Amino acid sequence: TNFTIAGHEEFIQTSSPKVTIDCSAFVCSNYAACHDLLSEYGTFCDNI
């Protein structure tokens, strides 16, 4: 017999922060001898 209007809210996630990771800055920060052992793992640093 008597009505009204109600209001609801909804949140839908559509995005996410885009992170970027690399081999050098994460494993061998500034050590030159560290990069020598990384040369053997040459291919396993671009697929990441």
Partner: protein, 49 residues
């Protein structure tokens, strides 16, 4: 591209001056020779060698 690091421009070196010597050579070269059964230990600290 790859990363880079800021190259240093100087060098900081700090030590304690006017410090006596450890004189380890006098301890090893002593007339009294110990025995492997009763070996002793000497601690060298706060000195230069």
């Amino acid at each position: 591209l790859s990363g880079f690091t800021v190259k240093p421009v100087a060098t900081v070196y700090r030590r304690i001056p006017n410090l006596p010597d450890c004189d380890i050579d006098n301890w090893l070269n002593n007339v009294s020779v110990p025995s492997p059964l009763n070996w002793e230990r000497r601690i060298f600290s706060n000195c230069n060698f």
